[PDB]
Write a protein that holds these residues in place. Sequence first.
Motif, PDB file in Angstrom:
ATOM      1  N   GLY A 150       0.773  -1.090  -0.061  1.00 54.58           N
ATOM      2  CA  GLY A 150      -0.141   0.089  -0.114  1.00 54.58           C
ATOM      3  C   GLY A 150       0.681   1.291  -0.033  1.00 54.58           C
ATOM      4  O   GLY A 150       0.184   2.465   0.381  1.00 54.58           O
ATOM      5  N   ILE A 151       2.096   1.198  -0.237  1.00 55.03           N
ATOM      6  CA  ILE A 151       3.028   2.357  -0.311  1.00 55.03           C
ATOM      7  C   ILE A 151       2.499   3.190  -1.427  1.00 55.03           C
ATOM      8  O   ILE A 151       2.271   2.657  -2.338  1.00 55.03           O
ATOM      9  N   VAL A 152       2.743   4.590  -1.374  1.00 50.90           N
ATOM     10  CA  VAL A 152       2.467   5.503  -2.529  1.00 50.90           C
ATOM     11  C   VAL A 152       3.764   6.371  -2.536  1.00 50.90           C
ATOM     12  O   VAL A 152       4.699   6.082  -2.113  1.00 50.90           O
ATOM     13  N   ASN A 153       3.581   7.088  -3.630  1.00 51.77           N
ATOM     14  CA  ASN A 153       4.874   7.852  -4.141  1.00 51.77           C
ATOM     15  C   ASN A 153       4.507   9.399  -3.847  1.00 51.77           C
ATOM     16  O   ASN A 153       3.533  10.150  -4.151  1.00 51.77           O
ATOM     17  N   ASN A 154       5.613   9.724  -3.109  1.00 49.49           N
ATOM     18  CA  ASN A 154       5.607  11.313  -2.794  1.00 49.49           C
ATOM     19  C   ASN A 154       7.086  11.481  -2.620  1.00 49.49           C
ATOM     20  O   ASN A 154       7.836  10.946  -2.354  1.00 49.49           O
ATOM     21  N   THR A 155       7.233  12.961  -2.529  1.00 49.55           N
ATOM     22  CA  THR A 155       8.678  13.539  -1.936  1.00 49.55           C
ATOM     23  C   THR A 155       8.631  13.872  -0.766  1.00 49.55           C
ATOM     24  O   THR A 155       7.767  14.852  -0.280  1.00 49.55           O
TER      25      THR A 155
END
Lengths: 20, 20
Positions: free
Chosen positions: A4-9
């Motif tokens: 469930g990990i998402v992509n973000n900075t």
Amino acid sequence: VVIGIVNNTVYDPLQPELDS
Amino acid sequence: VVIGIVNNTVYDPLQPELDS
């Protein structure tokens, strides 16, 4: 591995002082 | 003052980012 990990900075707080 | 304190090095994440 994390489900469930998402992509973000993640901004580095040291960068504004390093640039200036 | 602390009884049983051992000798070791502590990594500093600031120095490599600052140098580079």
